[PDB]
């Protein structure tokens, strides 16, 4: 990009944290599940206390509502704070079983400076690397029904009443790798068939309702 | 009703039994609501129980 390169060359020395999801969700609806257009965005942060730690516990929370699925997306820092700046929806409104497409993205730091990981001989990337966690969660909202050291660390959580299949690419890179042979921060995370997820939602709104949120710059 | 796909590799610091049928057996816990193995955190919900 015209912002990115010229930026990374004025930081060879340092480590931008950038975080990326894409998800594709298998759906399938209620009988009683009445088909929508609406889809519900937010990304909201939060710090909480670790008692046990000197370290504050920073997440960045996602979630999106479409199609009756509700997805939450949480990416859970110990002393360092990699925050979300935009989600993606694409889905399919009607009563039929579909896909419903997620993607997630962190800050991109040319737009606005994350913190540097490499700082205190690499002190953060230590906690990312030691006790980072990703937690999603999926579940039919409001519906009633007739009754190794690279791999990431996430909990899947999801209901089988909607979701009949997850499949997920996620990684969580030094931003500026595309300038580095090699970085010492560098994860990957794979559920189900992610290379197909990953090229698979670059093209799905031709045949899907697409909304986004993308958060303030500045 | 919950059913858990992939659980967190690092057990840390109430609970359910994804044994309701399912795709898979474990432990969600309530903390977020984080999932679980059977491995030696069976400690929190067998030893702290
Ligand atoms: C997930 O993120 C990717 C990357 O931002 C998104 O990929 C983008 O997908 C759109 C359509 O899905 C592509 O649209 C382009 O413009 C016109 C639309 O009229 C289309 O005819 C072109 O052929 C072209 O596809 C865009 O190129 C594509 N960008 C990249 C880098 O892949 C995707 O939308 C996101 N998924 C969501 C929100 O579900
Ligand atoms: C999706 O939405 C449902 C409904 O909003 C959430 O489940 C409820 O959570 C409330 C508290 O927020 C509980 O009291 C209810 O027992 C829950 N179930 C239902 C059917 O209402 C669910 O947590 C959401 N899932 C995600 C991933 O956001």
């Not at chain 1, 909201?44 to 939450?72: H, L």
């Not at chain 2, 796909?5 to 984080?34: A, H, M, N, W």
Request: charged residues 25%.
């Amino acid at each position: 990009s015209e912002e990115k390169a010229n930026f990374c060359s004025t930081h060879n020395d340092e480590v931008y944290a950038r975080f990326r999801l894409q998800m594709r969700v298998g759906v399938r609806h209620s009988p009683l599940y009445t088909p929508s257009n609406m889809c519900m965005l937010d990304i909201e942060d939060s710090v909480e206390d670790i008692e046990e730690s000197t370290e504050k516990e920073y997440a960045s929370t996602a979630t999106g509502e479409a199609a009756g699925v509700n997805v939450s997306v949480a990416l859970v820092g110990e002393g360092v704070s990699i925050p979300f700046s935009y989600i993606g929806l694409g889905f399919n409104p009607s009563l039929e079983d579909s896909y419903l497409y997620v993607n997630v993205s962190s800050r991109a730091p040319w737009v606005k400076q994350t913190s540097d990981l490499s700082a205190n001989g690499g002190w953060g990337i230590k906690q990312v690397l030691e006790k980072e966690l990703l937690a999603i969660q999926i579940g039919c909202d409001n519906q009633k029904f007739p009754e190794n050291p690279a791999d990431i660390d996430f909990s899947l959580l999801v209901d089988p009443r909607c979701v009949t299949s997850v499949d997920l690419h996620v990684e969580l890179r030094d931003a500026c790798i595309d300038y580095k042979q090699e970085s010492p921060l560098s994860l990957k995370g794979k559920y189900g068939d992610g290379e197909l997820v990953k090229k698979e939602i670059k093209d799905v709104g031709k045949n899907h309702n697409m909304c986004s949120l993308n958060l303030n710059p500045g | 009703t919950a059913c858990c796909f992939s659980y967190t590799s690092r057990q840390i610091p109430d609970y359910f039994e994804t044994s309701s049928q399912c795709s898979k057996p474990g432990v969600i816990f309530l903390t977020r609501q984080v999932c679980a193995d059977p491995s030696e955190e069976w400690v929190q919900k067998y030893v702290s129980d």
